[PDB]
From Swiss-Prot, chain C:
This is Ras GTPase-activating protein-binding protein 1. Can mediate both protein-protein and protein-RNA interactions via the NTF2 domain and RNA-binding domain RRM; protein-protein and protein-RNA interactions are essential for undergoing liquid-liquid phase separation (LLPS). The acidic disordered region acts as a negative regulator of phase separation. The chain holds residues 6 to 139 of 466 of the full protein. It comes from the Eukaryota. Phosphorylation of the acidic disordered region regulates stress granule assembly. Dephosphorylation after HRAS activation is required for stress granule assembly. Changing F10W: Decreased interaction with USP10. It comes from Homo sapiens.
Amino acid sequence: PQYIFGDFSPDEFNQF
Amino acid sequence: YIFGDF
Amino acid sequence: PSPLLVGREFVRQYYTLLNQAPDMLHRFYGKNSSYVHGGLDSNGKPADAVYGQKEIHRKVMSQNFTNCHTKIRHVDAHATLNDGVVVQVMGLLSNNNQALRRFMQTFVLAPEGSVANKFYVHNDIFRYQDEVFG
Amino acid sequence: PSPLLVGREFVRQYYTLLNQAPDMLHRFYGKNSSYVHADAVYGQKEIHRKVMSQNFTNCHTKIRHVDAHATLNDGVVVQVMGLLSNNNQALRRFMQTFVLAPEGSVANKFYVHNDIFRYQDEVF
């Protein structure tokens, strides 16, 4: 279950 | 102001 | 109800009662509240919180607070969701007349909403710096 | 929804975005959001300004401990203890207290209602 915080593109925090 | 039951 | 003024008064009471009568602190807390106060488990990891007026009293007792002196250095409080008050506190604590240890803490107060201008502690996160940093 | 896991994941997004694009930090908050880092600035526009007043550039963070518990109205309160280094500088200890509110409608979605940062060295 991936949590979202705020308003962001999808995948903003699946990049490295 | 009051805090808890005392 | 001004939060900065409420936080600042709550902290006054909390740490006065901790000095005078630690066995009563549990009266601040509501049926759903959480609590920690430093400590490491046997692996050297930070201790877990416990829950409920009952367990919080056990864990307070288990801490052996005796002639507990506190030197407050920083209080900041702000309205939060449903009229609550998040308060952030930094100070030093001395138990049993022994040395003063830096801590960092966070309270979430909730209205008892029965009355007015009344609150109970929903959350109490306290850690000693020395168990976490160096 | 598990407070610890929410909290660990937020913590990882926030600090990561602080290093990488502090100009986007304003998106964790909502219209009611409070930021304190000395009065508190409110809402997204003023938070962006204040974020950018601090000139964060390759800002590194060392996270030593996270506490994350359930709060009133399905929220999550987070205390974070760690060290921070802006722009190749000395690491300094801090605490940061967040309150995370369920965004209401959307499942597993939260926003930052409160954010209170304070350096230890500015206190002791």
